[PDB]
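Q: Structure for this?
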Amino acid sequence: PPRKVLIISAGASHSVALLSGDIVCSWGRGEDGQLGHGDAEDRPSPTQLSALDGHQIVSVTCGADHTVAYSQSGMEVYSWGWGDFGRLGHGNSSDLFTPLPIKALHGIRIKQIACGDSHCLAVTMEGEVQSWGRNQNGQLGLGDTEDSLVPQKIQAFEGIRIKMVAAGAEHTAAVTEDGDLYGWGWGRYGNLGLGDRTDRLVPERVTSTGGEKMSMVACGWRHTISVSYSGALYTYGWSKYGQLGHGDLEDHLIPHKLEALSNSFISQISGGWRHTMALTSDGKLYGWGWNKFGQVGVGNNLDQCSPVQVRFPDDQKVVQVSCGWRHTLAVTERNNVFAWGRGTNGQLGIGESVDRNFPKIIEALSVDGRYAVVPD
Amino acid sequence: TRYSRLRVIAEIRHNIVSSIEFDRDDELFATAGVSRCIKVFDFSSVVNEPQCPIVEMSTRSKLSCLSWNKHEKNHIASSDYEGIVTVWDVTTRQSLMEYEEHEKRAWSVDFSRTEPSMLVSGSDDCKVKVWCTRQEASVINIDMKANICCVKYNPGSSNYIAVGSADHHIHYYDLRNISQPLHVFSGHKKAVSYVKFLSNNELASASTDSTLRLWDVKDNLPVRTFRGHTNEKNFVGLTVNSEYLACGSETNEVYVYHKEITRPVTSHRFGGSYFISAVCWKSDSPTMLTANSQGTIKVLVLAA
């Protein structure tokens, strides 16, 4: 029988999926080794990442040009791709093309791992956070800007249990299990919801919600998306292409409720380079923001400044979504994987290298069916 | 004749640095490469302290070229492999401008010397674009029939540019009327990698055939040919002052030529399949910055 998709993720120009039986498949651009196949060759179609077979990989996430995965049964974390500046976690700046076990995080019961562009964070079962990578903008939350190659606990969260964290390019945003919202790092576009445009070196509580407790948080490049316990998105940050989806191109320095989606309960969110996706509890996928490559999946190439429902064939309900920098993936209630947006590196998994502006099925997964080189 | 060797004055150990450039006062210098990071260093500290970048700007793409602004000391332009030309401020580490008209990798970016706000870029989409640092729309757009590897404003005027493309030629364009190139320079066997100007009239170019060539842009005839280095596949780097030329090699060494002598007047070995990635003369002074594929930055000085 077909092997259903348990998890999906998207990075700069690569995509990854975790399939039943804990089989990690990856495709797209792999020139930096982020695909984990031992070679830099691109993969236009989903290619089974054989290196992780039998490791009981429980989840997988993708950074800019690096990927991380973790198995709870083995209590191990593997990483590959662009791993310098310590984001690899091996205590050295190695960029190997195959998964390697992060020994600095061996034996830690990881509840979640969020991969930023050049840093990663790991929420353990105890509600703690451990961060590593480069700390140029204080995004690691260590109170000061020095790089760290080893997962370092964020002492700013002493005694606070964190439900989840999301990492952007140079900023992050943790959400406490009590419902608070924290933001730190590159905050020079209103990214952090702190009411100004200064980058913070420590997790700072976001007071501009009106008592609203936050359940989820997703960080794009220069914007952030937040969902409340019983509400809808509270987007903020840079809004030049409408990625905040408030009907205008005005940026917001504090969590600003997205009133257009106030009529439906939002179950999941995601943010890419300059676009945003919001999956409701009813299985409807709304997309907005930058649409140059069609990554909003609304059937055109015009930037969408307000939420638009992305239509799937036969009206399939969407159970999962994940936005890349310039592409998006979605897993539907029928275990069909659709991909849209930019596909010049075949990250859409369709087997082609052309751009699609609306959901296209990945048949290999869906049940239905170098550098400084002078050009010649 | 005055110089016969290169003395090392400093060194910075890390990877590959593709562009290294001094600013208008030659006090600072910025480096960019695979790190996706523009690192601005103080030259005096580098040559005195036995180093740490005084500014670091992070990017979401690997960088290809880097150009300081001429009358705005703190402004530096960069081109990444996704075709985004960004003008940064090193004082505030902010992206002052972002131009995204290139559909592919942007190979070269250059600020005009006479009109500081003009910025010419050339990309793999076979497009040359001229932006003004007042609007986010390409002020001029030249479509060509080959990949553009280098674009360079004439030092004496912003109305003339030299475009070194993969068409094995250098197109000298008069931007006031872009119908056909004001000149076309041939004689290069492989793609043209680097374009520089010794003066208002002397153009130096480096191709991926181990060949540098002078050219009288006032005329259409060449002047000289320089051989003695190795350059077949890599952007080894080219730099020029009013009298000397210098280039990298796939043999991890920097060769220095006089504009009147074809044989290299000298060379220096960095001392593995490494190569020299970036080179840059400090003004007309004999000092020079050089960088190989290890990310090792060395400061060299012509001496007897």
